[PDB]
Every structure is written in C-alpha cells, then in structure tokens.
Amino acid sequence: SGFQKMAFPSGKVEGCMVQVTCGTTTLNGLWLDDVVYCPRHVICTSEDMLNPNYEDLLIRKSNHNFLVQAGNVQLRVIGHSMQNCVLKLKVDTANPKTPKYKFVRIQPGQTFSVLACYNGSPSGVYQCAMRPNFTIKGSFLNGSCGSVGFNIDYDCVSFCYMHHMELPTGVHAGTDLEGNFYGPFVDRQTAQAAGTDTTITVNVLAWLYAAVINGDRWFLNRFTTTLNDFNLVAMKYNYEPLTQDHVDILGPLSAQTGIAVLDMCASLKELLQNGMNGRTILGSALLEDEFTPFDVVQQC
Amino acid sequence: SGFQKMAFPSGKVEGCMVQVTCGTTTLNGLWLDDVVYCPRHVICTSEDMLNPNYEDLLIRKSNHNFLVQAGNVQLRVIGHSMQNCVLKLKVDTANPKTPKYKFVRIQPGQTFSVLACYNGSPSGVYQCAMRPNFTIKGSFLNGSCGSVGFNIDYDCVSFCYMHHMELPTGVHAGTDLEGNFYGPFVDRQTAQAAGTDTTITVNVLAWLYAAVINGDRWFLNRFTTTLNDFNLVAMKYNYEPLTQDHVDILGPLSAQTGIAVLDMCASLKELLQNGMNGRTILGSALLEDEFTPFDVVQQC
Incomplete structure (x- = not known):
C-alpha cells in the first residue's frame, strides 16, 4: 500500500492567510469572518523585545496603525483587542473564503499540518507533532511567525496552533488560537529552554x-x-x-x-x-x- | 532555522481534481480548461487488465459512457481522445479554477509534491522524488489512481506526474501528463520489477x-x-x-x-x-x- 508522512490539503486555509503590518515588523495573520488573528509581538521593536510591557504597548496604538493585506487588497481595521498573546483585529470585511472551522487546544502527541508562510503568502505545507515538552520540530524562517497548524475533519478546519518563536535549540514554540502558549514559554527575547524531550x-x-x-x-x-x-x-x-x-x-x-x-x-x-x-x-x-x-x- | 520535508501548498491543484467513472471503475482526473486528463485503464474490467487491447477497447466507448463530477456537478463529455496512456475528455465547460500551468517531464532525482485523492476528493499532500529506476516511494490506496505530482514556480503549476499503478515491491509507477510512463512500465496486470534502485x-x-x-x-x-x-x-x-x-x-x-x-x-x-x-x-x-x-x- 505505502506509508509516508502526509499533510492535510492546505487550500481551505490558504484562503485565510493575510499579511499584518505595524511599524517595521510584518507577519502572517489568520482571517476568519471579520476578525484577523495574529501574534501580538507584531507591535514590538527590538528594544521592546527584551522586556515588553504589552498592555502598555497596545492602547497607545490606534487602528490605523495596523495594516492588513489580503492579496493586493486592504482590510480596514475598525476594532482591535488583545487576547493573551494574540492580537485580534476586527475588520470592515468578512472573509468570503472562511471554511467551517473551530479552535482546539491539542494534547502532547497529537499531530497537525502546518502551512508555513512569509508575508501572508503560503510557501509550503508539512505534518508535525506537539512534542512532550510542548515544542515542535519544523521549518520556520524570518517572517514565518503567525503560520498556523490545523487538522481537517470532513470539511471542518480545526485550528490548533499559531507560531511565535524559535527557541535557541532550533525548535519552535507557539500558542493555540486563544493565545495561550503550549509549554512554559513567553513572547520575549530571553534564553528559554524546553525541558528534555521524550518519545511518544x-x-x-x-x-x-x-x-x-x-x-x-x-x-x-x-x-x-x-x-x-x-x-x-x-x-x-x-x-x-x-x-x-x-x-x-x-x-x-x-x-x-x-x-x-x-x-x-x-x-x-x-x-x-x-x-x-x-x-x-x-x-x-x-x-x-x-x-x-x-x-x-x-x-x- | 529548521529543516523538514515540505510540500508545495495544494490549493491551486485541489480545484482541478475531478472524479471520472466508466462502468464499475472510478478514479481521479485533472480538469484543466475544457479537457479532463485521466489514466486510460479506467476503461478496463479485471478480465481486460491481464492483457488490454486499449485501442480496441476505446472507440467502442461513446462519450455518454464517461461520467465526470466536479463536486456535486456533472460535466458533459463532448469529445474523447487517447494520448498514449492518458484518456483526455473534452467537456462542455472550462474549469474556472484552472491556474497558470504547464506540463513538464521531470528527470530522475527531481522532486515534486503529490496531492493524493480518492473519488476526485483530495485526501492529503506529500513531497516525493523520481527514483533512478523511475519508481516513487509514496502512499496510494485503491482509488488513488490519477493523483498528480506537481511543482509551483511563483504561481505557475508544473504538472509532472500522474499515478497509474503499485508495483509488487510496494512502490508506485505512473506517467507524465502526455501519457508516457516514467520507466519501462506498462499499464497491465503482469509482474513488473523496477530494477535495483540507487541513491541520488x-x-x-x-x-x-x-x-x-x-x-x-x-x-x-x-x-x-x-x-x-x-x-x-x-x-x-x-x-x-x-x-x-x-x-x-x-x-x-x-x-x-x-x-x-x-x-x-x-x-x-x-x-x-x-x-x-x-x-x-x-x-x-x-x-x-x-x-x-x-x-x-x-x-x-
């Protein structure tokens, strides 16, 4: 028959991917309905990345400070609210390509596909696992932040992951879609080890x-x-x-x-x-x- | 940075996949413009699969014998022509989801993504190589026949592969899109070895x-x-x-x-x-x- 590592078809998600900009930094965002979800560290400089006071840093941002692109098209941010480590940006427009979806928090050992992006444009797909120490072995370059993991059941897309950072050891940590880190990690530039990893x-x-x-x-x-x-x-x-x-x-x-x-x-x-x-x-x-x-x- | 095996995003192709039926057998087809490309062995029974006289077997088929579905929708076959080991079915309708595409014949060692299907519905994507002996190590169940391999350059889809058969040894042989087998293989049920495979x-x-x-x-x-x-x-x-x-x-x-x-x-x-x-x-x-x-x- 055959047996290889195999990801869910990426289409349905590809039409939810958007580019989000705020100052110098640009990254990937998930556009479902009239909300766009992305990592909150988009609102940081390098200075801010050593020890960010995010609540402080927001509020001092107005909607017009947030650029969103969906192909060569501009969504207008009409509201903005933070949910833990996600920024959520309400827009004037609903995504006509929104599939049936839900947000799940996965458990260690559960798998999912990752569609990895750069500048809100899909570059590639691969299949992954949520390691015991809540890290993932993947491929994620600069601009890959906000790339999501998912599973498809029939035609319902279960979002489980959003990418945030690469830990020194070369592996990747991130959140669920409610903005909570899998693992004991925090979005700041300070040397964070995942513990020793074990086999599933x-x-x-x-x-x-x-x-x-x-x-x-x-x-x-x-x-x-x-x-x-x-x-x-x-x-x-x-x-x-x-x-x-x-x-x-x-x-x-x-x-x-x-x-x-x-x-x-x-x-x-x-x-x-x-x-x-x-x-x-x-x-x-x-x-x-x-x-x-x-x-x-x-x-x- | 990270390094894993990584397939091209499958969307663009997912909207070219169609189910093709003829008698008992049903398989996957590629719908570009007002043509639908599929493996010609669709027109065989088991009897016929031991030693098929395909030219004979066609011609004795009329267009109405060919069922094509694109979701819950029916294309009408208005012409049908064979090109080596591909059947091509002209239809009344052009695919509004046709991307910029071309047909390439790849060389041993070149890679590509495979979107693997069952009944004209995408199940999954993975990355592959054209082995030296012109086989590929993949995953392909019953109904997987007509699943294609491709590469994307910018937004041009280079179709390189169509799946036909699993050789005893558990690996898969197929054609380019002009209907020519990679390797010395033929679409009939007779014990065919690929030669010893070498490393790239x-x-x-x-x-x-x-x-x-x-x-x-x-x-x-x-x-x-x-x-x-x-x-x-x-x-x-x-x-x-x-x-x-x-x-x-x-x-x-x-x-x-x-x-x-x-x-x-x-x-x-x-x-x-x-x-x-x-x-x-x-x-x-x-x-x-x-x-x-x-x-x-x-x-x-």
Missing part, C-alpha cells in the same frame, strides 16, 4: 502496527510483557509512560494485525535494548513517534 | 550542506578527493555517479558554507565506509537523498 510511546507503537500492515515484521519477537514491566523500561529510555487509555487507542490496530498490544510492547522493549543493528523498518533507521494511531488508520 | 548522490550532498547550514558538522573530516576517486567509491555503494553539472549545481551551496564540493565528497565517502555508528544528522540516522539542491535553497 503510543505513536511508536502505531508505527509498528503500520509497519506490520504494509509487511515488515522482522522486529516481531516471541516474548510478551506486563504493562508495568514494560513502563519500567520505557521510563529508562526517555519514552512517555503508557496508560490504559493508550492501550484502548491501539485496540482496533491490535485487532486488525492479530497482535496484542502487550506483545507489541515486548517487541518494542527489545528494539530499545538491542537497537536496530543496521536494519530498517518502513525504510527508516529510527523509531517514528510522529504518527498517531488515528493518523495510521486514516492513511490505511 | 547530488541530493545527499545538498542534504549535507543543509545540515552544515543549520549547524551539525560532526561528519566533516580532514580529507578531500578527486571526482574520479570519489565516483569509484560511489558506484560501489549504489550511488549514482556525479557529473560536473552536479558539481556546478552545488556551487552556490559550496560558496555559502565555505566548503568545496570535493571536500564534501570526501566527508561523504567516509560516512559510506564507516557508517554513522549510532549518530544522527539533522536527526535522521540515514542519508537523505530526496532533497534536491534547489529545494534546499528555497527552504533556506
């Missing part, structure tokens, strides 16, 4: 199911284990522990492959302890934790 | 430049080599040989990193011969040959 156990499992489906299987073993004895080897190898909820999530996959979750665990535990001695699995030489159980189904 | 040398290089840009570098060594002595170790490890054209292609990257192509080669040669002894490079434990030099630039 339940996903790696689902990867091993996918593998077995598309016909790989060398890594399967004789053994089985308890969920506890397993976990005790999980924690040792920077894997997130595995709940019963997680086991439940793997029930369908388990049922299809005729392989019990705790056996899969035993086969995984073994890989952790012996490595892959030069072998590959779905032609990767690493354990892929960025496919959720749900992702694997939909593709399969 | 020039791309792997560009990957090593990207790496060095985003700050990795452990794999750099003291040595240098000749292009010949290099090649003689390339051929041994299933790498495509490296022309002067390829060296020329890496000139810009070389100039940025302050690292001469033949030194990079020496550093690569060394990896080939010693492996990666547990290390990673841009967090992959393999050599990534599916980013062209051009791709790396645009992202960077």
